[PDB]
Amino acid sequence: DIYSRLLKDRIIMLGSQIDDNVANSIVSQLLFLQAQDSEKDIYLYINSPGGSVTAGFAIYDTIQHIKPDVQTICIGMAASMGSFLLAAGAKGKRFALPNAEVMIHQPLGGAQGQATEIEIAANHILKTREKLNRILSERTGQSIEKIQKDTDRDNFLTAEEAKEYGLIDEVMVPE
Amino acid sequence: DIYSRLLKDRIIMLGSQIDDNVANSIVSQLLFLQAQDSEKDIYLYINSPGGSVTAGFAIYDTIQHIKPDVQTICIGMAASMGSFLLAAGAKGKRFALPNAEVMIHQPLGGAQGQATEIEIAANHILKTREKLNRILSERTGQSIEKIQKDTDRDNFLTAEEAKEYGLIDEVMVPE
Amino acid sequence: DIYSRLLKDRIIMLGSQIDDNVANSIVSQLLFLQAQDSEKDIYLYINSPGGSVTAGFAIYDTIQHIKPDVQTICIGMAASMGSFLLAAGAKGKRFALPNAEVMIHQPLGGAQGQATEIEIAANHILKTREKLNRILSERTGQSIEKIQKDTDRDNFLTAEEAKEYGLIDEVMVPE
Amino acid sequence: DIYSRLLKDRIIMLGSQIDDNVANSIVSQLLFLQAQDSEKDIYLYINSPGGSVTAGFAIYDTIQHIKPDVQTICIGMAASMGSFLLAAGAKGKRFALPNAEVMIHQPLGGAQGQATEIEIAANHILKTREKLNRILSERTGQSIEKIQKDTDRDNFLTAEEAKEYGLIDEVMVPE
Amino acid sequence: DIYSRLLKDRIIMLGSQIDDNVANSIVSQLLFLQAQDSEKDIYLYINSPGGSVTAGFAIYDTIQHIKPDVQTICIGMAASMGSFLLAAGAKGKRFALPNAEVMIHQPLGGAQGQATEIEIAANHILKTREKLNRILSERTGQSIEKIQKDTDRDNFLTAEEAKEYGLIDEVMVPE
Amino acid sequence: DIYSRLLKDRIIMLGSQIDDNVANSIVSQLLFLQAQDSEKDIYLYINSPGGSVTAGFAIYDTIQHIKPDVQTICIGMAASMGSFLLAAGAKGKRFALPNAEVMIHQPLGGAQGQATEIEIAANHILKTREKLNRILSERTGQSIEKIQKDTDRDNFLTAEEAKEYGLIDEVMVPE
Amino acid sequence: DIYSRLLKDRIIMLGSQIDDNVANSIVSQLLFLQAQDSEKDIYLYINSPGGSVTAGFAIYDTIQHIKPDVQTICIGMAASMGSFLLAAGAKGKRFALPNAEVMIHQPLGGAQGQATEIEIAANHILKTREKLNRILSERTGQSIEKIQKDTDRDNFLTAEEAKEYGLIDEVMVPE
Amino acid sequence: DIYSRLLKDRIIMLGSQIDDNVANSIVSQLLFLQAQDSEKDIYLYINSPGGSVTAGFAIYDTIQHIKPDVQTICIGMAASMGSFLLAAGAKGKRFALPNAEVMIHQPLGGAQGQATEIEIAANHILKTREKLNRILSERTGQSIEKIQKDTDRDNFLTAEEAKEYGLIDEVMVPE
Amino acid sequence: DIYSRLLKDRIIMLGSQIDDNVANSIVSQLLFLQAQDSEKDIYLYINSPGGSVTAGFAIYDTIQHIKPDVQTICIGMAASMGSFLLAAGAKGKRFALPNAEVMIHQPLGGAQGQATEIEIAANHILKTREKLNRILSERTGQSIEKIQKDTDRDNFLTAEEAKEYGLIDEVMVPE
Amino acid sequence: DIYSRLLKDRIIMLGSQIDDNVANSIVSQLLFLQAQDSEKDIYLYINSPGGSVTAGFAIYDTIQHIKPDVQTICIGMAASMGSFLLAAGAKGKRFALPNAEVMIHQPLGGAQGQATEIEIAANHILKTREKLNRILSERTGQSIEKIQKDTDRDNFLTAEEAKEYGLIDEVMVPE
Ligand SMILES: CC(C)C[C@@H](NC(=O)[C@H](Cc1ccccc1)NC(=O)c1cnccn1)B(O)O
Ligand SMILES: CC(C)C[C@@H](NC(=O)[C@H](Cc1ccccc1)NC(=O)c1cnccn1)B(O)O
Ligand SMILES: CC(C)C[C@@H](NC(=O)[C@H](Cc1ccccc1)NC(=O)c1cnccn1)B(O)O
Ligand SMILES: CC(C)C[C@@H](NC(=O)[C@H](Cc1ccccc1)NC(=O)c1cnccn1)B(O)O
Ligand SMILES: CC(C)C[C@@H](NC(=O)[C@H](Cc1ccccc1)NC(=O)c1cnccn1)B(O)O
Ligand SMILES: CC(C)C[C@@H](NC(=O)[C@H](Cc1ccccc1)NC(=O)c1cnccn1)B(O)O
Ligand SMILES: CC(C)C[C@@H](NC(=O)[C@H](Cc1ccccc1)NC(=O)c1cnccn1)B(O)O
Ligand SMILES: CC(C)C[C@@H](NC(=O)[C@H](Cc1ccccc1)NC(=O)c1cnccn1)B(O)O
Ligand SMILES: CC(C)C[C@@H](NC(=O)[C@H](Cc1ccccc1)NC(=O)c1cnccn1)B(O)O
Ligand SMILES: CC(C)C[C@@H](NC(=O)[C@H](Cc1ccccc1)NC(=O)c1cnccn1)B(O)O
């Protein structure tokens, strides 16, 4: 299988929606790569429309925890939790290809039941948003109040705009 | 039709779920009965599992607004917005048959979408619960804190317990 | 319509499963009949497999509340809440045809959700069973503990067994 | 409507599956006809594939109970509970048109649940079959054990065979 | 039918979602009422969650065009196009009952297909929003800029808040 | 019924999608109104999203073919065949309410099967478009070239724009 | 397989809902790892929304039974039965990554059928909640009264709050 | 695969509902293990909600027939036929983990068709229940009369209660 | 597998709809091929109906971003994003077989929700179309306005027409 | 796998409907076979009901473009695009088994949407039919005018008739 080959070059492809299955695969790949060698870089290609917040945080925390630097490279599109993980790469080693698109927006969810259950769910998603904003602020240098306003609705960015936003460090030019 | 002849005796049957169709029928019947005679009493029989809050308030406010006293008679069951409307009858003229059951609980709803929209919906239903608690406190004489605690979960009441609670004035004995 | 003609003779047909629609129709027919004449007997024919408890209690309490005697006549079958309403007729005026079947059993229901919600639902249905047992004991003369054992599972009775049970007073012979 | 003009000639058409709705319609038509005149004959045309045992007994017991003779005339087909009601007409006044088919067979049913519940359901339907076999033996002049043997499976009979069997008295010839 | 005799009191009930069927019914009632008498007032009760913009404008333009004053009375809820029609009543004669809910928000829609067809749909709905904002500014005295910001998301208003906003003129007290 | 009342005033409401049922109803109403009086005007109110071309042409040809002038009044919306019929009213007597919308676009259809079957269906719809374009050109005073270009995609028009275009003669102002 | 290589390092990934299939896989992995070496530690990564109580106890009891210490590491989320198993790791060796979320709440279930069946199911789930509360009390040091109040509704905890609660021993810092 | 290496340690995992597929897998594992060695023990782990009686007896009879002792160890849950197989292990060698649950109840089934087919099915399931009771009485030392009463409804047992009942010999402690 | 033997000749088959899975496979194969040899040509056979813009740009940017020349050979059909990638091959090395079809058209999409959300989606797809038009203008030597007009609707091109258009350099002759 | 073994003898079996997956498999097998040896003959067995035109042309153009002669052998049936590929084998090496059936007919498709879109699709399928007719004229020696008339509807041919027609060169006799 072709991805088996790429893993020998320490390359991980995140090329789908992020659910728990995908997150456990990515996490296990990071841990496996760290075991083989704990100082050579890892390369995480990202072509993802987003997905679950907790699954995304499973990958995020693993990236920060392991010893090797994790380079992130957006090809095609990094939207929602995909752009959050793009910004999570080793600073100075976060890239996008020239025609890649990046999109940021606020979390989405749902809640049903009694008034108290809806209040619990609303409080949980607002806390989850404040937590995502605070971390994105630390990864980009944007202020939390600006993240909050810029993610009120869907916010599409070119690769160059993503760099000026601080989500990546360089647009990768050919070749 | 049987209900049309009962209407000539100024009797209205609320015997179903409360949605907008039912609420409009009940409201129009109260209006029509007030026009025919504005001082003879009206009798509202209630056998209802509850329904929409705004459809319920359409009936509640029409009862409060018109001239005639509206007697409320719970037969079978008055649950949720049903029991709220039972408590809304003219004071001294709120009844339940001996084996009727009354149930009270907090509102239920749902919300989907972005975090800010879920927060808007959560705030709306909590505000709605506060409004219902306040009115029920006025109709029963119980405190708002007691209502709030007693409606945290489904709360089933006998006709006698509903009288002790202040939801009704008397249990109707034969004949 | 044929049932309209029978209502002229103060005859009500209960020939279906008992839900809120059926109960409100039956209740309105009883009240309409009492208005026309409050001393002439009413005849309630019962061919019913049962239905909702609260809908059944809407009919029960109305029968006990109005002035006229309500005679009950089982044709075909009175099961579950149907036999409960059969036993509710004016004492001495509860009948069944010779090949009618009567069936008694304990209530059924369902509950889903949190442990506390299931606890609340279980407590409500056990309270509802104790109430049904107590009233059936008063209508039949059977002890509450015998009702409890006899309704543990489905209990089919001939018309003659139903009379010796106290659910009816006489088996109607031709003509 | 055509059937109500026929009711003025004391003609009742049973022309469908026998459920509770149909049984209550037929029963009410018999009582109504007896009320208008309690001596003049009633004519019950039967074209039915059968139906519910209890619904059929509602019609059967009403036929035996009223004062007027009830003639039964099979047109097209009287199967299962249909043929039971065909045999139920006033003796000497049970007919079939020359090309009508009569079918008899044993009761069918179903049972789901615990072993004790399946035993209760089996006993009930076996008792039901014995009661039907006994009545048909009285109405036809055949032995119970012959009825049992001849209904073990679907048993189709011509009009002439139904007369030979005792289910009807005469085959109706033109004119 | 109850709504028929209410119409003789010049009362119209808008108690459902607004589609073309409902709109054509309301419009024909307004025309019919003007034909019988063209100076006596008309009373339009509103309990509606909203609906189609063009259906709503059929009712709006008819209200403005006919000669009689059209009073608007919100019972239960006036949301979206329902609250737009509430504010369309004759000034000084727009009411809400004390527990009625009013909600305002921006239009919603959908678009599918080629880029140029999506552009056509976006331009059409933004033009529609500008037209709604401008009319609501005229009916309420609020500025278009405030309407735009206040309708960005769902905005729930009590009867008292709707009066302060200018959507209604008075909250209707008993009796 | 309310529409029967309006038809005595020679008012016809076209308030739905135009299919064959609707067309036959409108056509029969026009024929019936012409028979009652062949000189007094007829008023066709239009709130329609369009529909079938042949159903539309049934109404169109009938309007052209009856002696009385047929006034057309767009309320809410006249799109597609709806706006074609709006433009078909007696010149000088075509109206729209101030907030009515008008939309024009080319016909739509489908074709499946062999190549020669698809070619036949393509030629039939192109000939249909050319006929519709020519007739609309004559009703509006526009060139066929301009109609063709302006209906290539969905084209939304305000009431004032529709008057400028020649689809209506006057915007109806209040009173 | 990537999970196969991690099993070489005595790492087990519980990254899904807990049903019987998953529980048997986790149990067999623990058994297999103990047989290979009964004194080297085992590492249980948890990213789970929870699941079946009995499947959870199959894993819990196997963890307690075997010789090796079992470290638990919450990545992403440990909700419900997932957080119960997180607290079950060897004391001193229960961890969570800094942005992992932990949630605790009371059990859920369902019951259908006769009143006595519903009572049996209610008693079972309440007994199951008492058992879980008691064990969690032992694992965290919190009182059973506190657990019972804190799990009445969904209760979301940060990694730091989970440490304060006693569900984990340390938050894992990089690197 | 993990279960293969466990089979080398003579471990069999019964961790699912028991149907014919599972039974044939378990049976072939028992025979395969006997062929390799006919005197060393076999270990059957049981986490099962139950299943088919005949599939269960395929496993039961195979366990009794082969030479090696089969230890049974309930993890998580042994319900219905699962608890029957738990009690089927070699006496002295039947265990449950401390938080395992055990449930016993009477068989369930269904029957549809003619009265004689229902009677056949009823007799077959009653015979099956007598056979299960007699074997369980032998495995546990309890009387058949007590088994019959204790299995009338669902009967949940802790590991300790199962030992007292005789279903297991010991609750296995760590480690 | 046949495609892996072709990969050793540096042949990549793009023979399906272009989604993220396909894009990541193609990207992985380009990277892998560049790693084995960074100067020898790569051959990308294209038989595709098109697909996702972002997935297509993942392949496009990878093609421009590797050192080796990528020849593109259209077999069967290159439509939509398929034809975009066909034009993306190394200039002078873009081919089509004599009977391959090439189709170009403008992007398609959808948008649902509030007016502001629809405007965001419309602007994003219009910007996407502009970006695609500019690149195709550079790759084909046609003007932006000609690309815009020629893609307003589906535009089918033979292999020879595709060469005249600049989408390919040569039509590949036999053999 | 059996088809792998036959590829050793340079045998490719086209035995299914022709879509893009199948076409890419066949194309890749031809290229792979040409790589191993570019002068040994290839044998393509055809048993196909047809399929996509563009997928068929992918196979056709590859057959003409490789160096080796491709023999075509129809077994069972070559219908529609299947017979087109049969006629495409190296002249003198196109065969059919004596009972194989051959069928030719004109292309089929479908179109939906605006009139201009149906015209585009009609023109495209007509152009495709003309290209198919011209190539088959060249492969068979029949005139385009004869192909056009013979493919108006389904035209079934025996192996012998296919030889007379020019679709094949010889009917294969045993052995
Ligand atoms: C940066 C952030 C915007 C990324 C993703 N956003 C989300 O909102 C996801 C959407 C979702 C996915 C599957 C199932 C339901 C919901 N929401 C949650 O995981 C969540 C978290 N905490 C509480 C409630 N929900 B993105 O891909 O859009
Ligand atoms: C508690 C009692 C006094 C009244 C009723 N309780 C409710 O929860 C209803 C239930 C509902 C069901 C289906 C669809 C919608 C609503 N909730 C609302 O109307 C509502 C209002 N505002 C915000 C959110 N929800 B009862 O009678 O059922
Ligand atoms: C004498 C009595 C045995 C009669 C009826 N028995 C019942 O169990 C009904 C059945 C039912 C039917 C449809 C949907 C749900 C339940 N149960 C309730 O109404 C109920 C349940 N829980 C709490 C309060 N009430 B019988 O006639 O079916
Ligand atoms: C003389 C007699 C043979 C006539 C009818 N026979 C039946 O079996 C009916 C069929 C049926 C229809 C609807 C729903 C269930 C069953 N059975 C019962 O009504 C029944 C069953 N079990 C216990 C009590 N009653 B016939 O018309 O076929
Ligand atoms: C702001 C408030 C006055 C709006 C009310 N209606 C809407 O937003 C509707 C929603 C809808 C209803 C039926 C069918 C489709 C869509 N949208 C349109 O009608 C529409 C959309 N795009 C262009 C033009 N019009 B309210 O009830 O929400
Ligand atoms: C353009 C405008 C003046 C009128 C309407 N346009 C249409 O295309 C309708 C839509 C349709 C309805 C039912 C079934 C299929 C299609 N098309 C036809 O009736 C038709 C199509 N092909 C040949 C002949 N007739 B409008 O409402 O959009
Ligand atoms: C850890 C605990 C606080 C909640 C966890 N599980 C539950 O509540 C489950 C929900 C469920 C899932 C699948 C199938 C059935 C039920 N309930 C039961 O297993 C159960 C046990 N005994 C009696 C009744 N129910 B958690 O992970 O949600
Ligand atoms: C007491 C306890 C040991 C019962 C176990 N099984 C059953 O009761 C099953 C339920 C069932 C399962 C699959 C298909 C159909 C029915 N019933 C039968 O197998 C059966 C056999 N013969 C006659 C009638 N029924 B337990 O494990 O659930
Ligand atoms: C490049 C041009 C020749 C058209 C090609 N692709 C498209 O139009 C796709 C269609 C699609 C289908 C399913 C899911 C998503 C998109 N549209 C987009 O990707 C898109 C989405 N949002 C904004 C901008 N673009 B071609 O292959 O049809
Ligand atoms: C040999 C030839 C005369 C007929 C063969 N195929 C066709 O006619 C297919 C039918 C079809 C199959 C799959 C999907 C869509 C349509 N049509 C096209 O491929 C097509 C052509 N031109 C424009 C658009 N589509 B045969 O095998 O039937």
I74/I171 Cα distance (integer angstroms): 10
What's the token pair of residue I119? 């405007």
The resolution of the experimental structure, rounded to one decimal in Å, is 2.2
Q: G37, G44, G36: which is closest to G64 by C-alpha? A: G44
**Cα H38 to Cα H25, H30, H69, H72, distances in angstroms:** 19, 10, 9, 18
> What is the secondary structure of D7-64 as a DSSP string?
HHTTEEEE-S-B-HHHHHHHHHHHHHHHHH-SSS-EEEEEEE--B-HHHHHHHHHHHH
Residue F171 contacts E where some CB pair is shorter than 8 Å = no
The residues, any chain, with a CB within 8 Å of residue J119's CB and separated by 6 or more, are F122, F126
A158/H171 Cα distance (integer angstroms): 64
What's the token pair of residue D70? 């009830």
The position carrying tokens 């297509």 is I56
What's the token pair of residue E81? 């196009």
Instruction: Report residues whose beta carbon is within 6 angstroms of any ligand 5 atom.
Output: E 50-53, 80-81, 84, 105-109, 124-125, 128, 132
The residues, any chain, with a CB within 8 Å of residue I41's CB and separated by 6 or more, are I10, I68, I69, I70, I71, I90, I93
Check if the beta carbon of residue D35 is closer than 8 Å to that of residue D66. no
Q: Within 10 Å of residue J93's Cβ, how many Cβ atoms?
A: 17
Going by alpha carbons, the residue nearest to atom 22 of ligand 1 is A125
Q: Phi first, then psi: what are they for H60, rounded to 5°?
A: -55, -55
CA of H114 to the centre of ligand 4 (A): 9
D83/D140 Cα distance (integer angstroms): 11
CA of A133, nearest ligand number: 1
**Cα J114 to Cα A174, F113, F152, I153, distances in angstroms:** 43, 18, 9, 11
Residue C5: alpha-carbon gap to chain centroid: 24
Check if the beta carbon of residue C67 is closer than 8 Å to that of residue C34. yes
G117/C126 Cα distance (integer angstroms): 11
**Residue H146, CA atoms < 13 Å, CB-side half-sphere:** 9
For a pocket test of ligand 1, which of A14, A18, A21, A52 has the largest count of ligand atoms closer than 8 A to its C-beta? A52
For a pocket test of ligand 2, which of B108, B128, B135, B137 has the largest count of ligand atoms closer than 8 A to its C-beta? B108
Number of continuous H segments (helices) and E segments (strands) in chain E? 7, 8
Strands H11-14 and H101-104 come out as unpaired
Number of continuous H segments (helices) and E segments (strands) in chain I? 7, 8
Sequence length of chain E is: 175
Chain C: give the shortest CA distance to residue D129, in Å.
13
Q: Which residue of G has its CA nearest to C125?
A: G115
CA angle, G112 as apex, G110 and G117 as ends, to 5°? Answer: 105
C15/I95 Cα distance (integer angstroms): 80
CA angle, F110 as apex, J110 and I149 as ends, to 5°? Answer: 80
Catalytic pick among D52, D105, D137, D143: D105
Residue A11 contacts I where some CB pair is shorter than 8 Å = yes
The verdict on a CB contact (< 8 Å) between A107 and B116 is no
Considering only the beta carbons, identify the residue of C116, C118, C125 that sits closest to G115: C125
Q: Is C14 in the pocket of ligand 3 (CB under 6 A)?
A: no
Residue B16: alpha-carbon gap to chain centroid: 12
Which method was it determined by?
Answer: X-ray
What's the token pair of residue B138? 């006025």
DSSP, collapsed to helix, strand or coil, labels residue E113 as strand
What's the token pair of residue G100? 């992992």
Check if the beta carbon of residue E30 is closer than 8 Å to that of residue E66. yes
Strands E94-96 and E170-171 come out as parallel
A56/A59 Cα distance (integer angstroms): 5
**Residue H63, CA atoms < 13 Å, CB-side half-sphere:** 25
DSSP, collapsed to helix, strand or coil, labels residue C51 as strand
G14/G79 Cα distance (integer angstroms): 12
**Cα I129 to Cα A76, I85, I145, I155, distances in angstroms:** 15, 15, 12, 16
Considering only the beta carbons, identify the residue of J105, J110, J129 that sits closest to F111: J110
Q: Within 10 Å of residue A67's Cβ, how many Cβ atoms?
A: 11
Q: H161, H165, H163, H55: which is closest to H107 by C-alpha? A: H55
Annotation marks residue F105 as catalytic: yes
Sequence length of chain H is: 175
CA of D16, nearest ligand number: 4
D17/D15 Cα distance (integer angstroms): 7
Beta strands in H25-154 (DSSP E): 42-48, 70-79, 94-96, 101-104, 108-114
Check if the beta carbon of residue A101 is closer than 8 Å to that of residue A76. yes
> What is the secondary structure of B5-60 as a DSSP string?
HHHHTTEEEE-S-B-HHHHHHHHHHHHHHHHH-SSS-EEEEEEE--B-HHHHHHHH
What's the token pair of residue A164? 């000026």
The residues, any chain, with a CB within 8 Å of residue B158's CB and separated by 6 or more, are B101, B102
Considering only the beta carbons, identify the residue of G20, G29, G116 that sits closest to H47: G20
CA of A76 to the centre of ligand 9 (A): 13
Classify residue G66 by its DSSP letter: S
Classify residue J18 by its DSSP letter: B
A140/A64 Cα distance (integer angstroms): 15
Residue C150: alpha-carbon gap to chain centroid: 17
I72/G8 Cα distance (integer angstroms): 45
Q: Within 10 Å of residue D123's Cβ, how many Cβ atoms?
A: 14
E147/E133 Cα distance (integer angstroms): 6
> What is the secondary structure of D121-174 as a DSSP string?
HHHHHHHHHHHHHHHHHHHH---HHHHHHHTSS-EEE-HHHHHHHTS-SEEPPP
Chain C: give the shortest CA distance to residue B85, in Å.
18
Q: J118: exposed, middle or buried (C-beta count within 10 Å: 0-12, 13-18, 19+)?
A: buried
Check if the beta carbon of residue E151 is closer than 8 Å to that of residue E128. no
Q: E118, I104, I126, I17: which is closest to J120 by C-alpha? A: I104
CA angle, B72 as apex, B69 and B75 as ends, to 5°? Answer: 160
Residue C172 contacts D where some CB pair is shorter than 8 Å = yes
D59/D25 Cα distance (integer angstroms): 9
D105/D97 Cα distance (integer angstroms): 21
Beta strands in F7-88 (DSSP E): 11-14, 42-48, 70-79
Q: F126: exposed, middle or buried (C-beta count within 10 Å: 0-12, 13-18, 19+)?
A: middle
CA angle, H147 as apex, H146 and H153 as ends, to 5°? Answer: 105
Q: Is D104 in the pocket of ligand 4 (CB under 6 A)?
A: no
Check if the beta carbon of residue B82 is closer than 8 Å to that of residue B63. no
H111/H105 Cα distance (integer angstroms): 19
What's the token pair of residue D76? 């097209």
Long-range pairs of E29-33 with CB within 8 A, sequence gap ≥ 24? E29/F2, E30/E59, E30/E62, E30/E63, E30/E66, E30/E70, E31/E62, E31/E66, E31/F6, E31/F11, E32/E7, E32/F2, E32/F5, E32/F6, E33/E7, E33/E68
Q: Is A84 in the pocket of ligand 1 (CB under 6 A)?
A: yes
Residue A40 contacts G where some CB pair is shorter than 8 Å = no
What's the token pair of residue I82? 């398929």
F105/F151 Cα distance (integer angstroms): 4
Amino acid at B42: I
Chains E and I touch, contact meaning at least 3 pairs of CB atoms under 8 angstroms apart = yes
Check if the beta carbon of residue C68 is closer than 8 Å to that of residue C42. yes
Amino acid at H140: T
**Cα A18 to Cα A56, F154, G96, distances in angstroms:** 7, 39, 21
The residues, any chain, with a CB within 8 Å of residue C96's CB and separated by 6 or more, are C73, C74, C75, C78, C86, C102, C159, C162, C163, C168, C171, C172
| Contacts G126 to C, Cβ<8 Å | 115, 119
Q: Which residue of G has its CA nearest to H157?
A: G124
The verdict on a CB contact (< 8 Å) between G115 and C121 is no
D13/D26 Cα distance (integer angstroms): 8
Q: B14, B8, B121: which is closest to B58 by C-alpha? A: B14
Residue D24 contacts C where some CB pair is shorter than 8 Å = yes
Check if the beta carbon of residue J19 is closer than 8 Å to that of residue J27. no
Residue C119 contacts B where some CB pair is shorter than 8 Å = no
Please identify, by atom number, the ligand 4 atom nearest to the C-alpha of residue C101: 24
Q: D82, D72, D11, D23: which is closest to D48 by C-alpha? A: D82
The verdict on a CB contact (< 8 Å) between J121 and F126 is no
What is the rounded end-to-end Cα distance, in angstroms, of chain I?
26
G65/G57 Cα distance (integer angstroms): 12
- Point out which residues pair with B42 in neighbouring strands: B70
Strands I101-104 and I155-157 come out as antiparallel
Check if the beta carbon of residue E62 is closer than 8 Å to that of residue E74. no
What's the token pair of residue A136? 């994105």
Please identify, by atom number, the ligand 3 atom nearest to the C-alpha of residue C51: 27
A51/J14 Cα distance (integer angstroms): 41
Domain G1-175 class? alpha beta
The residues, any chain, with a CB within 8 Å of residue A143's CB and separated by 6 or more, are A137
Amino acid at C104: I
| Alpha helical stretches, state H, J69-173 | 81-86, 115-140, 144-150, 159-165
Check if the beta carbon of residue E26 is closer than 8 Å to that of residue E59. yes
Chains G and H touch, contact meaning at least 3 pairs of CB atoms under 8 angstroms apart = yes
The position carrying tokens 């077994």 is J75
Check if the beta carbon of residue J94 is closer than 8 Å to that of residue J87. yes
Going by alpha carbons, the residue nearest to atom 1 of ligand 8 is H107
Residue D125 contacts H where some CB pair is shorter than 8 Å = yes
**Cα I160 to Cα A133, C73, I166, J58, distances in angstroms:** 54, 91, 10, 16
- Cβ burial B4-19 (10 Å sphere, 16+ → b, else e): eebbeebbbbbbbbbe
Amino acid at D57: F
DSSP, collapsed to helix, strand or coil, labels residue A1 as coil
Check if the beta carbon of residue I64 is closer than 8 Å to that of residue I88. yes
G57/G63 Cα distance (integer angstroms): 9
DSSP, collapsed to helix, strand or coil, labels residue E129 as helix
Strands C70-79 and C94-96 come out as parallel
| Contacts I122 to E, Cβ<8 Å | 111, 118-119, 121-123
Q: G6, F121, B20, I76: which is closest to A30 by C-alpha? A: G6
Chains B and C touch, contact meaning at least 3 pairs of CB atoms under 8 angstroms apart = yes
Give residue D119's region: left, alpha or beta (phi > 0; psi -120 to 50).
alpha
H22/G87 Cα distance (integer angstroms): 34
G114/C126 Cα distance (integer angstroms): 10
Beta strands in E101-160 (DSSP E): 101-104, 108-114, 155-158
Beta strands in chain I (DSSP E): 11-14, 42-48, 70-79, 94-96, 101-104, 108-114, 155-157, 170-171
Q: Within 10 Å of residue F160's Cβ, how many Cβ atoms?
A: 12
H108/H117 Cα distance (integer angstroms): 17
What's the token pair of residue D138? 């009285």
Check if the beta carbon of residue A122 is closer than 8 Å to that of residue B111. yes
C22/C14 Cα distance (integer angstroms): 8
Residue F144 contacts J where some CB pair is shorter than 8 Å = no
J34/J30 Cα distance (integer angstroms): 6
Classify residue F168 by its DSSP letter: -
The position carrying tokens 């006769």 is G114
The residues, any chain, with a CB within 8 Å of residue I66's CB and separated by 6 or more, are A175, I30, I31, I33, I34, I38, I42
